[PDB]
Design a protein around this ligand. Structure first.
Ligand SMILES: CN1C(=O)[C@]2(N=C1N)c1cc(-c3cccnc3F)ccc1O[C@]1(C)CCCO[C@H]12
Ligand code: NI
Length: 393
């Protein structure tokens, strides 16, 4: 899969994008890779933050579906017109597919100034597509129309401009040059988000000792479309307390722990060893087994280059509070080669050949850990009448 290696780019904190083409002849756009959503949606009108957009009128193969789509979310929205057109990934498989495309005609706090992406590739399942689960997501169309195996994998690699990032999205396979050591699999609990189950959490080898359902309240997901590691309120508080204790030689302002303020050291003198490792134990394929993924402060402290003191190394705390469950975002994924094995309803983790580390510690993937009479750590989301009333033909 050499032709797919290094096909992702982006700016730190602003998402990873892949080059895609839409229409006939091919119109190149940079598209955010988002395992936390399920629509293929592209800028299709002028916007202050867009240098270019999908020009439907320039495409001989474009078909209008005569249906609108409205997608509000926490502090943002995009909306537009549904249609289909021919789509390819120049540095992906050598195929062209007819996919659903949402042509974004209006948006609020969706596009990001300087991110260099013009659309989003929702790689999650039909259940969370908009307007409804009948709108076939891109990857579903790719698999159905081609011989491409039902699997993709992601290797996300971490003074005037933001730091550039890079990585790889391997479509249809696993590239063994992108990882070292063992590849460990956790079940996809349900096909909507890429939902998984966390059975144990340790901070510097110390168990948080919470009921494991707290770790997955109200879900735990793997999301390339989230920057941070996001933790449920109770878990976040316990984690911050533990990380504070380990790093107590340094007294940071409350702003830092809230992700609202940078902390700095003189170039190259960052005391990495005072910040603890964080281990998340994920449910194994075998009932009473788990494996752990361990990440370093190099992952959860994001470098942000300052203009006022460019001689210092400055960092944002990239663990944040959630009210919608655990989110293993770019913070987690940057340590690992992550395999979204849809065919076998599982997610694989292995140590990434590109992750940032020092000479004393490394990001790790270790197992098995077996537990006698293991509890059910999954949370069951209360069923609303709205949801219950849906018919699923
Ligand atoms: C959590 N999350 C989002 O907020 C989201 N995708 C995910 N997964 C998302 C993330 C980013 C982003 C911004 C900065 C860095 N990285 C990104 F992915 C940009 C847009 C965006 O829009 C949605 C697709 C619209 C529907 C709800 O989800 C959104
Ligand atoms: Ni019915």
């Amino acid at each position: 899969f050499v032709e797919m290696v290094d096909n992702l780019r982006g700016k730190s904190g602003q998402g990873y994008y892949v080059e895609m083409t839409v229409g006939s002849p091919p119109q190149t756009l940079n598209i955010l890779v988002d395992t936390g959503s399920s629509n293929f949606a592209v800028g299709a009108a002028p916007h202050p933050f867009l240098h270019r957009y999908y020009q439907r009128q320039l495409s001989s193969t474009y078909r209008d579906l005569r249906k609108g789509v409205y997608v509000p979310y926490t502090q943002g929205k995009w909306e537009g017109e549904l249609g289909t057109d021919l789509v390819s990934i120049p540095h992906g498989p050598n195929v062209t597919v007819r996919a659903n495309i949402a042509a974004i005609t209006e948006s609020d706090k969706f596009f990001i100034n300087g991110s260099n992406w013009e659309g989003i590739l929702g790689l999650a399942y039909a259940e969370i597509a908009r307007p409804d689960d009948s709108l076939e997501p891109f990857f579903d169309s790719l698999v159905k129309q081609t011989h491409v195996p039902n699997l993709f994998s992601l290797q996300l690699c971490g003074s005037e401009v933001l730091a550039s990032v890079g990585g790889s999205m391997i479509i249809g396979g696993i590239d063994h040059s992108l990882y070292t050591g063992s590849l460990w699999y956790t079940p996809i609990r349900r096909e909507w988000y890429y939902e998984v189950i966390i059975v144990r959490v340790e901070i510097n080898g110390q168990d948080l000792k919470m009921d494991c359902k707290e770790y997955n309240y109200d879900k735990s997901i793997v999301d390339s479309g989230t920057t941070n590691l996001r933790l449920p309120k109770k878990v976040f508080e316990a984690a911050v307390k533990s990380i504070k204790a380990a790093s107590s030689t340094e007294k940071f302002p409350d702003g830092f722990w809230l992700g609202e303020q940078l902390v700095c050291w003189q170039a190259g003198t960052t005391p990495w060893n005072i910040f603890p490792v964080i281990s998340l134990y994920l449910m194994g394929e075998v009932t009473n087994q788990s494996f752990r993924i361990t990440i370093l402060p190099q992952q959860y402290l994001r470098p942000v280059e300052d203009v006022a003191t460019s001689q210092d190394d400055c960092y944002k705390f990239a663990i944040s509070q959630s009210s919608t469950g655990t989110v293993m975002g770019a913070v987690i994924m940057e340590g690992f080669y992550v395999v979204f094995d849809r065919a076998r309803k599982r997610i694989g983790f292995a140590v990434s050949a590109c992750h940032v580390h020092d000479e004393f510690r490394t990001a790790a993937v270790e197992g098995p850990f077996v537990t006698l009479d293991m509890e059910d750590c999954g949370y069951n989301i209360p069923q609303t009448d709205e949801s219950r009333s849906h018919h699923h033909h």
